[PDB]
Design a protein around this ligand. Structure first.
Ligand SMILES: O=c1ccn([C@H]2C[C@H](O)[C@@H](CO)O2)c(=O)[nH]1
Ligand SMILES: O=c1ccn([C@H]2C[C@H](O)[C@@H](CO)O2)c(=O)[nH]1
Lengths: 264, 264
């Protein structure tokens, strides 16, 4: 995608040399914002082949308030294995904060139902937020939230959403981060009888790993392809009743996939 | 300031008509980012006269973990009167979350000391965040946090900071929001022996009230003046030991102040 290749280029020309946790060197910039008008197509990178099936499964897993790996494993989605303990537990990461934020007095707040309530009954609210940055629970999480905080906005029959991402690996993680969130904007929109608007991605430490340089140059050689179309085959009775087979990507013709290794 | 006048213009040309809580109409945009290099001068708007003395006093008040109005009143700073109850209490707003975030198990987390610890002993961290969006305490706050979440970043001996602001009144509140945060970047920098870098302002619902149109047009007529210089007369022994008289703004020559009324 144009916005994405322009950001890859920006990190190459402007990033400062910064190191990652006792390991790999990175080219790094701080503070960046991109906008995707979801009416123009689904923001799935076409300059390299991306597999959406793990993305869908992880999102549906988050929506259930699930913090254990078992569901992902029944579907052979293995992207959280690296962090999970011996019982498949990741600690109170994303879905637990989304669905059951714990208060000092013993309550558990369902931020996802609050947001749908606000979108239906108070759409002009400037407070339609869900946050995963729970300070009191960060020491028990396998990893602190990267996509930490997001806000919905309604204007002119259209749902927009801005994500704050504290930390971003531009090559491996970001195409996945964008498709994940654009999919949720479409599910929320369908549930509230709204049209989709914009996904605004805002990042903090936005970077490229030094051993991914040959791959980023290979990708920047490539011209972007027409963006694909997401079709949802069914309107579920609530946001928590979606199934993997409800989603289809139509018109997706990427360039070949590129492998990105990581140090250990 | 150039960036600020370009944003005022953007809300005029691009904002959609959106209404505020059962009241005034606004011109509204969603998703905006601006960068201020603090080496180029202190980002205090010169196209209208702004009074910094309440800004300093409110920031020092936040740093003490103070949620009651008394301190502001001893100095005749009256900007929080509107929200305070009969005893001067505002509920667990900003300073209480900054200094004593309450956990489900009875602890109180000092996010400001954590951030200084990280800046001194782990400066490359992608997790140097303080958040005021405490979901479990939002129903007891006088108003939910507008400047909700911010992240520090260190690269090349320089401290940068990005603020996420959920909601912003461009005319009355934003010049105040920027100077408040730019001042804290300078205090944190002084305490960590770092130089100042950039203040990145990111906003959610960024707007202009309909009864402020004559004033925004008057301000856009004006050419920006050279930005002022902030001098700190003393290095305190910690971030919690600053005093009002430690700060001086040098070289500030604004255009006359403009009044902005509000509906009730
Ligand atoms: O949603 C995510 C999660 C992690 N990362 C990156 C951040 C950093 O590069 C590394 C942290 O484990 O992986 C992302 O890009 N996106
Ligand atoms: O730091 C702040 C606090 C409030 N507001 C605005 C948001 C909205 O316009 C109104 C909410 O009371 O005041 C700001 O611009 N900045």
């Amino acid at each position: 995608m144009k916005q994405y290749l322009e950001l890859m280029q920006k990190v190459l020309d402007e990033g400062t040399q910064k190191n990652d946790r006792t390991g790999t060197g990175t080219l790094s910039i701080f503070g960046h914002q991109m906008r995707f008008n979801l009416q123009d197509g689904f923001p799935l990178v076409t300059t390299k082949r991306c597999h959406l099936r793990s993305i869908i499964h992880e999102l549906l897993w988050f929506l259930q308030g699930d913090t254990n790996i078992a569901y992902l494993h029944e579907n052979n989605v293995t992207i959280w294995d690296e962090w999970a303990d011996e019982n498949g537990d990741l600690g109170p990461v994303y879905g637990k904060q989304w669905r059951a934020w714990p208060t000092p007095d013993g309550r558990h707040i369902d931020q996802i139902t609050t947001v749908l309530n606000q979108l239906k009954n108070d759409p002009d609210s400037r407070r339609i937020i869900v946050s995963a940055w729970n300070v009191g629970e960060l020491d028990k999480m396998a990893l602190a939230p990267c996509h930490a905080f997001f806000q919905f906005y309604v204007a002119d029959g259209k749902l927009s959403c801005q994500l704050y991402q504290r930390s971003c690996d531009v090559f491996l993680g970001l195409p996945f981060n964008i498709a994940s969130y654009a999919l949720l904007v479409h599910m929320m929109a369908q549930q509230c009888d709204l049209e989709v608007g914009d996904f605004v991605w805002t990042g903090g430490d936005t970077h490229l790993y030094s051993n991914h340089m040959d791959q980023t140059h290979l990708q920047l050689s490539r011209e972007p392809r027409p963006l694909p179309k997401l079709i949802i085959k069914r309107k579920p009775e609530s946001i928590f009743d979606y199934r993997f087979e409800d989603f289809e990507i139509e018109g997706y013709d990427p360039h070949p996939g590129i492998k990105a290794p990581v140090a250990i």
